């Protein structure tokens, strides 16, 4: 009849009463960590202030002073390295205030993961998502370049590209906030490629389009290729670059050649648009920045291998 | 000389030693909450299972049974309401697994705020951001519609729109995951408006453009207006709709009129594109869904006021 419902009801009564006891404990513990994070904020304060203070002290110690002062400054520098090391390792496990871009998108929400295992899991996903879409990019680009020629599909492709680049901005900005710091060219890169595909999204199907489309689609396929085989090197060290560097240089030069083709094509036919210049410029800037940063980084690693 | 540096160094030594003691305590407490959330998850399990079980029990009790069984089922339904109330109030303070869209963008990161004050602060920001951009939208749209007529600026405007709608998708999806549930038409709305501005981003500056542009820009200005004065009603209750409903209906009908203008304009001139149809359809679907949902909601509130 219904006595079974009555019995399971009676049981679940004290069950969820104990559950609510655990829940009160859990709420107390959530306010407890919150007040402990308030507390550590003072540790953050000392972290900045007294560090930078000893920094300026050593900075004012550079003048010529007795042997005692040079020896002391030596000891200070030999300790401050591990000092900042300790303090950064400390701060790494504290939820951090969002930056500017991530704030303007996600509002004011905390995203820090405060758990090394979580950081590894997150980066593994950040790589798998990159790979899967790099595959769908190669496929769609090649199909649009060979199997048919229709402006609608170029529009769809350029929309996929701008979406992909914006999503990578969001992802790698959480990653920057959360863990390692890749601050440098590899953000403006995405910022200058999305605007590129933008200004290419509005070509008025003239003749310049039928003279630039093939170069652009081939280059997109090949750049997607180098990103497709950039994953493997990240996963599995120095001997790897020995095969990657020729491909990276071939890519930089392919893109440089496209930029020149564009910046030149705007000089002979009956007319043109503004888009020829406004789309050739991104490419040149991409080449300059990318070549510059890659060579500087490989020189830094070469100099580290030197010593 | 340097003795001051030595003194402040000596002090900061035990200072940050105590800091590290607090830090060890804090780490222990973070693993403590983590294991407590593992625990409460069993509470989640019972929450789903035994609830739905008593649900199916009451469902099987609908048949005609003695007075004891109808009275008992009455007591069960009179308790289950507050039962689910308790259990949802409980679950509301548990970090939740991300959905589908937010997962495909932000990876696998937890965003729940687990603090009522945080929810209020977040929604207040979600409203202020909406307002500020609704202002910049009105301004730019009106300027593009009157002060000059140039296709570049229409492109910029449509890009601003698609960006804005995607950002609102992200924001309000974090909001859905975090607190109240607005599941319904007010997500596909943004999903069908971004694609609208998309398919309008690629008009080949024919004549159809010079016959549709004025209608579209006026309607954008007015829809931005109704969003600009939707904030105030949300902030400061039933007497408010008494003035808003005429504006909402005027807007729905303005958009219906644009959809008809488009779906018709594709029948007389020398030629057209596919964009006329692929852009008139969104508008019709917007009108249908929006009118439908608004009227259904106002009828629901009218029926709640009835009883």
Author numbering:
A (entry chain B), B (entry chain A): 8 to 243, 268 to 338
The authors write:
Here, we present the cryo-electron microscopy (cryo-EM) structures of both human TMEM120A and TMEM120B at overall resolutions of 3.7 Å and 4.0 Å, respectively. The cryo-EM maps of TMEM120A and TMEM120B reveal a shared homo-dimeric assembly, which is about 80 Å in height and 85 Å in width.
The transmembrane domain (TMD) of each protomer contains six transmembrane helices, designated H1—H6, enclosing a large solvent-accessible cytosol-facing cavity. In addition, a short amphipathic helix H0 parallel to the inner membrane was identified between C2 and H1, flanked by two intracellular linkers L1 and L2. The dimer interface in TMD, which is along the C2 symmetry axis, is mostly mediated by van der Waals contacts. Notably, two histidine residues His150 and His151 of the critical HxxHH motif in the catalytic site of ELOVL7 are also conserved in TMEM120A. Nevertheless, the similarity of the overall fold, cytosol-facing positively charged pocket, and a potential bound molecule in the cavity imply TMEM120A may be an enzyme in lipid metabolism that catalyzes a different reaction from ELOVL7. Therefore, based on our experimental results, TMEM120A could mediate conducting currents in a bilayer system, but does not behave as an MSC in heterologous system.
